[model samples]
Target: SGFRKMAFPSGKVEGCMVQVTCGTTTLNGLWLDDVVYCPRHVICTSEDMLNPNYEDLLIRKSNHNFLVQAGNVQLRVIGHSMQNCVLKLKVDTANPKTPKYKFVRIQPGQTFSVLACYNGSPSGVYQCAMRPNFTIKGSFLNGSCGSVGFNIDYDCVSFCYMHHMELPTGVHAGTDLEGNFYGPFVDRQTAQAAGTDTTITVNVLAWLYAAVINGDRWFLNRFTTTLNDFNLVAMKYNYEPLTQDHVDILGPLSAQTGIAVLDMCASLKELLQNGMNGRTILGSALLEDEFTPFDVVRQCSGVTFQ
Candidate 1:
């Protein structure tokens, strides 16, 4: 499975002390794959950290020129100040002209996060198409105290998930791929069918378990489900980008199930059994915004791979 930790506010930090109002602030950092985010205030007294000639305090002016994943960003602000300061994000020319992001006040030694500038579609559907140019800014009130400043950290995390009907693509041998599974109760028909099928004398569950465990690509490629809804489904152990096929298969399913598929094959049996036993409540409904692959595996399989 292609499951990984959500890369926002990772809680991993750098070890550089920057002077702020006679106090040094430890450098806290967060990152996501190929995504750039707003900057935070950073300064140092020694040249090893940052040259002292620039001033006692400094904020990185670099701008992250990358698409916002899943239509939004996760920004975390770690404050190391002697007084109050405010932070805001300014939209650039990429997206339609809109007001600058709302201002967030940061008190001394305060840390907080925000889900910044989400671009939800008109029909309430979401996608990861493009991100408008944007930058984060900070302002600290002077005269209250010396060397008072705030770091511009924000948390903007949006899920990039797949639907059940969408076929996988971009196959590369020896590389792990994403898979999909229905959330508890979301696809009752599929679940009940799979569960009952497992109870048959053929011991289909063990076969599936063995195939998935041993990575039997040929078996998966040749195998087809008995369900009428998707008898011809071509199971893939590969990654896929959301494209035209994704759009076509997502008709009304979002409204009905509110669930996204998982990459782990273990959930195939768990979902079916859970639904058959009428215990399909796994935290929340199967909405895309509701459950993550990590949550489903953790709760259903009693395992946390991520």
Candidate 2:
């Protein structure tokens, strides 16, 4: 980034001028500056000087009768830097009773500048008919606040790496279970047998996963690519299977869809219909036990399984 500068021109009691210089840089940048001028005045009254404060000060003297030189001055550099600046000013206040004041912003490095002016008014003597009032006038540069808007682009691989790397250490370690299956919703025995520490770990992982996915679009999109799509396939099998063979066909179907084929197979009801058949299926694979209850109220209420 380059440097920035500003300058103010000489002017009479009723007029003023300002100038600015900007610098260049490879990437986009911004600059800001401010300046203030306080008019010199003398107070002689004991009463006026007793409790005089800057906030209560009012402008009392002006050579051209115009008490104010300028109301407010401002400058903004959007994509540039203002550097290296100077100011030259002249004021006419030949009358001893009236004084002139001016303000100018001095650039600092690659930032902008601000300038201000103030005045002193009323009488300069003790117990006079009128007393001096002090006034402040100033200008600001590059003064803006709200929200920042910008465009960004990066590689998908880089984004993926950064996303995973940024995951909380607790979640990464806790979610890496033996079967690589991570979730708070577990089978009844596992959920009940989980120790306090394990339960807390599971809760934290669940909360962090939810927060990260819900708050960040990139994370949510990746989750869909990596997890939700498989869940959707499993849901299709759960809802649309016609018979035992059709459900059994989901084994290869889920494998083709990149789902956990064994897990999907274990979720079928017909495989658990016969005790020996269920035992054979369980013994042949690393299938964990699951429980499903009959809808007693619906069955007794004459709701058929049409």
Candidate 3:
């Protein structure tokens, strides 16, 4: 097989970074010893930045926003190159026979954000394919590489784009225009803009309700009331999941959905930093881990500590 594999340190390695030599190839899989690393958090860099036109270049920024054909997500092309890198962007146009194909040339140390084709005039799939093999790079503080060529493929998927709307009571969820899910809000005022809020407590009745309902349909059955039983139904549905960290992590509420998970233990401590509890949720303590706990957290946000 012409496929290649990128391997990281076996175990207990803190902040593992790999220096890769340039070649026109893509990795079939990333590994931590023998186990395949899902949502591989790896980065590659090329020192030929001074060359200005080195074919072996590094994509410093790409793929943060989802690349829907007709959405608010602007595709950004920025990176380190010896000269300039060329990208081929193709979007569907009103003329069904003629899709627009634009060749964008990006200079070293320069950035360009590609706007949608007429902001998705004819709603269709769009993609940007690099002309040259650019070394894909990412950081925990930024974004990660799902595929190189940095191939950006997106569709017109409508998501919640409203900002600061009050979360609907019970078994609720919020997602951004980009489709990133957010959980509970800190307070009644702090809104779930674009459906992505991470500063929330696990014990919040709303989040717990959403989590429980999202995970177990049996709970849904138990909570539904007849015309005469609305109050009883609300009471049962409002009941919180077990508060233990271990139990919550494995329970239906947290595990079943993609809501941003917070380490309740740390959040509770920070919540009470002073003699009295703080009214706001500290953003730093919230954990945004998702794509299942079995895989590495996919966001470019910093490392998560238990």
Candidate 4:
């Protein structure tokens, strides 16, 4: 949000090719939006809109005068240079109130400063333009002196959670390659294990089911068997695993029967038919984080703490 102007270091003067260094700075005036400099070559002939090249280089001149209407605004100029040279400073302003005049000054070796302001009149687009309007008034000295411009636009300063119960694993959604029953598994041993074991088992089942069914390999099984046990008891008589022709024909019913045999170890446990009951088991157990103990009983009356 700034503008930059380029000038030859010492084009016309001797040693002009010696890399003439001219540092340009600006000060804001009272009324103008931003006091900026347009390099001599840029198409800043008009002040309507700024050239894209000099974006950040452009300096925002202080609107000191607040005379957005348009008129000549005054600014101070001061600087010193070594040799007798012609110095030109370009000014570009967004508001038409900027001046269309130039400031020509003589470059003397000693520190010399002058006060000059520009008039912004008949305000319209590109209302102002400024350039160095000075000649070396004194001797053509060899050394260089610094030049500084002010109000270049200068304005006066002013003060300003979760838990869960568990249930027996429910029927998995799909069948294995062997057409074996696949889905969540609720091994009674795993369920009967400690809460940590139950959580790991349920999580493993969930992960396995998710992997096989949803292709989601990444899953968390944090709840222990206590959660599952509570859910199983709650949904006991209601749970059932889904069975298909595949399971009936290709599944290891023998292995499944053996697995079922393990449930008998728990006199207090029983396998509910899969489907709504299994869903209730899994859902309630999975959602133990959402339901209170009382809420669990209310939702799935079959669940018991014992």
Which regions of candidate 2 are displaced past 4 Å? 1-267, 282-306
lDDT of 1 by residue, 12-74 (tens): 111010111212422211122222122222233344232232223434322231122222333
Can you give the TM-score per candidate against the true fold? 0.17, 0.13, 0.18, 0.12
Give a tens-digit lDDT track for model 4, residues 43-93.
122332233323222232222311121222333222211111112222233
**Largest lDDT belongs to which candidate?**
3
Question: On a 0 to 100 scale, what is the lDDT of residue 235 in model 2?
Answer: 44
TM-score, prediction 4:
0.12
Candidate 3 overall lDDT versus native: 0.22
Candidate 2 residue-wise lDDT, 191-220, digit = tens: 122212201111111222222222311211
Q: Report lDDT (Cα) of residue 153, candidate 1.
A: 30
What's the candidate order when arranged by decreasing lDDT? 3, 1, 4, 2
Q: How many backbone clashes does candidate 3 have?
A: 10
Candidate 2 displacement at residue 125 in angstroms: 94
Local distance difference test, each candidate? 0.22, 0.19, 0.22, 0.21
Reference-based TM-score, model 3: 0.18
C-alpha RMSD between model 2 and the true structure: 29.8
Two-way TM-score contest, 1 vs 2, winner: 1
